[PDB]
Amino acid sequence: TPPQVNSILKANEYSFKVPEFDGKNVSSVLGFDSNQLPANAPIEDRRSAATCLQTRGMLLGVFDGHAGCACSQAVSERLFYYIAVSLLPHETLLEIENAVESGRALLPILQWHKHPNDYFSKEASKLYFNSLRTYWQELIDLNIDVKEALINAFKRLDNDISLEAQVGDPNSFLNYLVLRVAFSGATACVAHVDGVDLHVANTGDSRAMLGVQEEDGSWSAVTLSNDHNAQNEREVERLKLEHPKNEAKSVVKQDRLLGLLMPFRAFGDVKFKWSIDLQKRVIESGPKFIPPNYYTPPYLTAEPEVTYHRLRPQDKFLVLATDGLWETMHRQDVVRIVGEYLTGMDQNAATHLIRHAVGNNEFGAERLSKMLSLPEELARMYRDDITIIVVQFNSHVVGAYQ
Minimum CB distance to Mn ion, residue 17 (Å): 22
Phi, then psi, of 130 in degrees rounded to 5: -65, -40
Given phi > 0 = left and psi -120 to 50 = alpha, else beta, which region is 68?
Answer: left
H or E segment and range at residue 389 = strand 386-393
Q: Which is nearer to Mn ion, 196 or 358 (CB)?
A: 358
Are β-strands 315-321 and 386-393 bridged in parallel, bridged antiparallel, or unpaired?
antiparallel
Task: Provide the minimum distance between the beta carbon of 34 and Mn ion in the complex, in angstroms, as a whole number.
Answer: 16
Residue 398, helix vs strand vs coil = helix
DSSP readout, 267-288?
A: EE-GGGTS-HHHHHHHHTT---
**64 labeled binding residue:** yes
One DSSP character per residue, 7-52 reads HHHTSS-EEEEPPPBTTB--SSEEEEEEEEE-SSSS--EEEEEEEE
| Residue with Cβ nearer Mn ion (52 or 71) | 71
Q: Can you give the binding site for Mn ion, defined by CB under 5 A?
A: 44, 64, 66, 322-324, 365, 384
Contact 232, 147 (CB under 8 A): no
Q: Give the ranges where 105-246 is alpha helix by DSSP (H).
A: 125-142, 146-167, 172-183, 233-241
Nearest residue (CB) to Mn ion, 43 versus 127 = 43
Distance between CA atoms of residues 107 and 130, nearest Å = 16
- Tell how strand 267-268 and strand 185-186 pair up: antiparallel
If the CB atoms of residues 277 and 377 are measured against Mn ion, the closer one turns out to be 377
Residues 6+ apart with CB under 8 A from 104: 98
- Report the residue number, 61 or 324, with the smaller CB distance to Mn ion: 324
Is residue 211 within 8 Å of 204, Cβ to Cβ?
Answer: no
Identify which of residues 169 and 333 has a Cβ nearer to Mn ion in the complex: 333
65 is in an annotated binding site: yes
Would you say 301 and 269 are in contact if contact means Cβ atoms under 8 Å apart? no
Q: Which residue, 75 or 397, has its beta carbon nearer to Mn ion?
A: 75
Q: Find the residue with minimal CB distance to Mn ion.
A: 365
Is 167 within 8 Å of 191 (Cβ atoms)?
A: no
Shortest gap between Cβ of 361 and Mn ion (angstroms)?
A: 13
Q: How far is the CB of 187 from Mn ion (least distance, A)?
A: 8
Q: Between 58 and 257, name the residue whose CB sits nearer to Mn ion.
A: 257
* Environment class of 194 (CB within 10 Å of its CB; exposed 0-12, middle 13-18, buried 19+): middle
Report in angstroms how near the CB of residue 356 gets to Mn ion at its nearest.
Answer: 6
Please, are residues 289 and 256 in contact by the beta-carbon 8 Å criterion?
A: no
Query: If residue 388 lies in a helix (H) or strand (E), which one and from where to where?
Result: strand 386-393
Shortest gap between Cβ of 197 and Mn ion (angstroms)? 29
Q: 158 among the known binding-site residues? A: no
In the complex, least distance from residue 135 CB atom to Mn ion, rounded to whole angstroms: 27
Nearer CB in complex with Mn ion: 44/118: 44
CB of 331 to Mn ion, least distance (A): 16
277 annotated to a ligand binding site: no
Beta carbon of residue 344, minimum distance to Mn ion (angstroms, whole number): 12
Q: What does the alpha-carbon distance between residue 9 and residue 402 come to, in Å, rounded to a whole number?
A: 40
Question: Per the annotation, where are the binding residues for Mn(2+)?
Answer: 64-65, 323, 384
